[PDB]
Design an enzyme around this catalytic site. Structure first.
Site, mmCIF file in Angstrom:
data_model
loop_
_atom_site.group_PDB
_atom_site.id
_atom_site.type_symbol
_atom_site.label_atom_id
_atom_site.label_comp_id
_atom_site.label_asym_id
_atom_site.label_seq_id
_atom_site.Cartn_x
_atom_site.Cartn_y
_atom_site.Cartn_z
ATOM 1 N N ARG A 193 -50.371 -56.182 -12.346
ATOM 2 C CA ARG A 193 -51.661 -56.129 -11.730
ATOM 3 C C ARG A 193 -51.509 -55.464 -10.371
ATOM 4 O O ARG A 193 -52.473 -55.408 -9.639
ATOM 5 C CB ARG A 193 -52.278 -57.532 -11.565
ATOM 6 N N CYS A 241 -55.838 -47.775 4.888
ATOM 7 C CA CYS A 241 -55.910 -46.667 3.944
ATOM 8 C C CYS A 241 -57.328 -46.093 3.923
ATOM 9 O O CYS A 241 -58.308 -46.789 4.253
ATOM 10 C CB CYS A 241 -55.519 -47.119 2.520
ATOM 11 N N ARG A 244 -63.112 -45.979 0.954
ATOM 12 C CA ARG A 244 -63.823 -46.719 1.957
ATOM 13 C C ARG A 244 -65.115 -45.986 2.389
ATOM 14 O O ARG A 244 -66.038 -46.608 2.915
ATOM 15 C CB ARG A 244 -62.924 -47.003 3.124
ATOM 16 N N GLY A 265 -67.629 -42.437 0.814
ATOM 17 C CA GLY A 265 -67.609 -41.342 -0.080
ATOM 18 C C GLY A 265 -68.790 -40.415 0.248
ATOM 19 O O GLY A 265 -69.927 -40.837 0.200
#
Lengths: 258, 258
Positions: A123, A143, A163, A165
Site C-alpha cells: 500500500r 511535494c 496539490r 492543478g
C-alpha cells in the site's frame, strides 16, 4: 457507458459555475474549487483528451527526459533538481547537470518498479515530485505531486494527487503523462494497465482561459485512442520515443491557452 | 440536498458489489477499490457519522494527544515517533518520550497555522503523517497520510489523502478527527470551517466486517450534529477536551467491528 473525458468537461463546467475567485503566487486570478477526482480507464484505450489536440509528442519526450533524471534543459542550461533528479536521485546532493549520480540518493522510480515485482499488495508504492522553487525555500518542503500505484489481478493502477492543478493547460497534459508512465511500468512488470485516477487539491481555471474553455465545452468527445508499445522492453531506462504509437486519435482542433 | 453520510454508505455499497479480493500486510483478506473521494460540509454541522455511534470522546482525546506531540502512550510506554512527534518535531532525532524537543525538527502543525495567517492563498499548506513502522524500514519512506488546507473567503477547507483506508473502522474515525482538526485550526486563525474532503488510495473492507456493514447500510442517516467550541482559544496547544461540545447527535446503535 460514458466517455471518460466527460469527467474533465464536467469539472471545467463546475469550476466555471461554482468556482470562487482566488489569486495564485504571482497575483494572477483563477476560478477555484478545492478537491476533485476523476478516473480514467487504461483498459484497451488511452486517455489522450479529444476535445482539443493534446501535444502527445511533448508528453512523451518530457516523460522520457524525467525518467533519464536529467537536469539539462538542452536534452529537451543547468536547471537544478526537476522531476527526473527527484525521481531518480532523491536526496543526493546536486552539483552540475553533467555530474555523476550513480548509486546516489533514493531512486524512487526503480523503487516503485522493484516493489511492484517483490510485493504487489504493498500500500506504499509511492513516488513524489517537488516544484524546484520550493527546495531552497524551506526545510522538508511539501511535494507538488504524489503518485501511488496499486496492483490487483495483474492490473496496475495509478493515482496522482496534485496539490494544485491548472485545469486548462496542465491537467490534460498530466492525465496523458501519468497514463503513459503507468503503461510503461505495467509493460516492464508484466502487468496490464488498469485505472488512472487524478485527484486535485486547488483545481483552478485561469481567467484568461474561461472563453477558450467555454468553447471547448461545446465539443463532443470522440473515442479515446489506443497506445501501442512496439517492442518488448526490459528496463524503464530502455524506452525511447520510437517505441510508442498512438492509434485512432481524432481530436477536435488545437486550442491555445496561454 | 442529500445528507453527507450518503457518500460513505455509497462507497461501502460500491466496495461490497465491486471490490476485488486483496490481502493486507498480515495476509488478512479485504474487498478493495483503488481511488475514492468524498466531501463533507463543515458549515453549521459536523460530520460525526450517524449510522453507528462513533467514539467521539476517543477522537477528541487522541487528536489532543497528537497535538501535544506525545510519544507517551500513558498520556492516552515509549512508543517512538507517532503522529504527534512527526506533526510537531519532524526530523528531530528521537531519544525517550520524556526528553526535550523545543525548537527541534519542523513543527508541521504550527507551520500550517502560520502559513494560513501569512499567506492564505498558498497552495502548499500541507502536513504529513507516517506509520511509525515504516520509519526504520527505509530511507525517505512514504507518508501514510497527507493533509492539505485551503482558504478562500475566510473559510478553511481540508483534504486528507490516505494511502489506504479501513472503511469499517478507520474511516469514520478519521472523518471526525480531521474535521475536528479543521474546526480547531479555523478557530485559532479566525476563519470559518468550510469542507472536509476525504480521498483514499486502497479503500478496503475487511472480510469480517462485511456482515456488520451490510446491516449498517440498512440504516437511514440522521442530521449531523453541531460542534461548539465553548471558549475563545488562542494557540493550538491551549485546547482541552472540555472546550468542545457535540450537540444534537442522535446516532443509530454501536456496531462492533474488530
Amino acid at each position: 457507458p460514458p466517455h471518460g473525458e466527460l469527467q474533465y468537461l464536467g469539472q471545467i463546467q463546475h469550476i466555471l459555475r461554482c468556482g470562487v475567485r482566488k489569486d495564485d503566487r504571482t497575483g494572477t486570478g483563477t476560478l477555484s474549487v478545492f478537491g476533485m477526482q476523476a478516473r480514467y480507464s487504461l483498459r484497451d484505450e488511452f486517455p489522450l483528451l479529444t476535445t482539443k489536440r493534446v501535444f502527445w509528442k511533448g508528453v512523451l519526450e518530457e516523460l522520457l527526459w524525467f525518467i533519464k533524471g536529467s537536469t539539462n534543459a538542452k536534452e529537451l542550461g543547468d536547471l537544478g533538481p526537476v522531476y527526473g533528479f527527484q525521481w531518480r536521485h532523491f536526496g543526493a546532493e546536486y552539483r552540475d547537470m553533467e555530474s555523476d549520480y550513480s548509486g546516489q540518493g533514493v531512486d524512487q522510480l526503480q523503487r516503485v518498479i522493484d516493489t511492484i515485482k517483490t510485493n504487489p499488495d504493498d500500500r506504499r508504492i509511492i513516488m513524489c515530485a517537488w516544484n524546484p522553487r520550493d527546495l531552497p525555500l524551506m526545510a522538508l518542503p511539501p511535494c507538488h505531486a504524489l503518485c501511488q500505484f496499486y496492483v490487483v489481478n495483474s492490473e496496475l493502477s495509478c493515482q496522482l494527487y496534485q496539490r494544485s492543478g491548472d485545469m486548462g493547460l496542465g491537467v490534460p497534459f498530466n492525465i496523458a503523462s501519468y497514463a503513459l508512465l503507468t503503461y510503461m511500468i505495467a509493460h516492464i512488470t508484466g502487468l496490464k494497465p488498469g485505472d488512472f485516477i487524478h485527484t486535485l487539491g486547488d483545481a483552478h481555471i485561469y481567467l484568461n482561459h474561461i472563453e477558450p474553455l467555454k468553447i471547448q465545452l461545446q465539443r463532443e468527445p470522440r473515442p479515446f485512442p489506443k497506445l501501442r508499445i512496439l517492442r518488448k522492453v526490459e528496463k524503464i531506462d530502455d524506452f525511447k520515443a520510437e517505441d510508442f504509437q498512438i492509434e485512432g486519435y481524432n481530436p477536435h482542433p488545437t486550442i491555445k491557452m496561454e
